[PDB]
Structure formats: C-alpha cells, structure tokens
Amino acid sequence: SEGMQFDRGYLSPYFINKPESGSVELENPYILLVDKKISNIRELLPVLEGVAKASKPLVIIAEDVEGEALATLVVNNMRGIVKVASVKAPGFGDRRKAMLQDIATLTNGTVISEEIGLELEKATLEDLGQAKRVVINKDTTTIIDGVGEEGAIAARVTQIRQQIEESTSDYDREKLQERVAKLAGGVKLN
C-alpha cells in the first residue's frame, strides 16, 4: 500500500538529491509520460518552459532518455536550473505501453504517444501527471499518492482483472496481477 513501485531506477546518479540515501526525493512533482525514446532536447524545451514557471520538480518516465536530451537534463539539474529526474518506463513491448498508461491513469497524466498523433513538442503542463511524492534510487521508482480520478483508477484495475480471466497462463496472470498490485499501491487515501 506504500506507492506504486517499479523496477527502474535513475538514468543518472546526478539526479540524486538525497546523497545520504543515494536517492531522488521529489515533492509534488509533475510527471511526463512518453512511450518512445527521447534523444532530442528540442522536443522537451516547450514542456521544460512550463516547468520553469514554478518550483515544482519534473520526473520523466520514457522508453529511454539519451544523448543530448539526457545530457541537458543532467547538466541543468546539476546547475540547479531545474529539479528533474528521468527513469526508463518499466517492462517491455506492449506491456510497457500498458504500464505507462497505468501510470497515466494513476496520476491524471496523458501518455505522449505518436501512435495516436500526439507530439512531445506540443505537450503541456496539463498533460503531466502529478503525485504527492516520487522516490527513485538506483534500482526502483515509487510513485506515492497519484492524483488520478478514483473511478478511472478503479475501472483500470477492474479491466486488468478481467484480462486475468481471459488467460490460462500462470506467467501472464502473475504479470497482470502485478499491474493490479502496483495501481493499488499508488492510490491516495486520507
């Protein structure tokens, strides 16, 4: 019940902001969800402009963040220009896409997906998910108290649970149950 946790850690230790625990702890962050690799910093500039309007940190969960995009995020973070962290989206292939949506639903975010005609350079603050806290270390990412609408989160879980009923695979069922447990962990109470 202590957050949605998945087995991807920081993409660079230079995102650490709690050196004594080797971790990134970000309070009331925006959460950018992207179902592709990000390499071109120009794609992120517009969103980063929005984040620059306040003191809210940004967590980027993308298929990967690499090259000039990652380097600029690391340098800006080290300089204190922004408070940012990046992690790889959990999982593989279709399940990775489904789990990015699990996170979007949990956090009231929108997955920036070219599959449906969305473009990273046109992403806005309104597209970003939010949660009370995100904690990242070398191995894991934990999203605590996502702000997603309860009905939407419940409907998502119920849908995953029906998917379990459509399977006769122990492996696949366990993986679906894991998605359920993760969503449940991330809910916001009291």
From TrEMBL:
Location of this chain's protein in the cell: Cytoplasm
Domain of life: Bacteria
Keywords: ATP-binding, Chaperone, Cytoplasm, Isomerase, Nucleotide-binding
A Gene Ontology molecular function term of the record: isomerase activity
Gene Ontology CC annotations of this record: cytoplasm
GO BP of this protein: protein refolding
Protein biosynthesis recorded as keyword: no
Primary location: cytoplasm
Complexes and interactors: Forms a cylinder of 14 subunits composed of two heptameric rings stacked back-to-back. Interacts with the co-chaperonin GroES.
Known function: Together with its co-chaperonin GroES, plays an essential role in assisting protein folding. The GroEL-GroES system forms a nano-cage that allows encapsulation of the non-native substrate proteins and provides a physical environment optimized to promote and accelerate protein folding.
Family classification: Belongs to the chaperonin (HSP60) family.
Name of the protein described by the UniProt record: Chaperonin GroEL
Natural source organism: Xenorhabdus nematophila (Achromobacter nematophilus)
Included range, full protein: 191 to 376 of 548
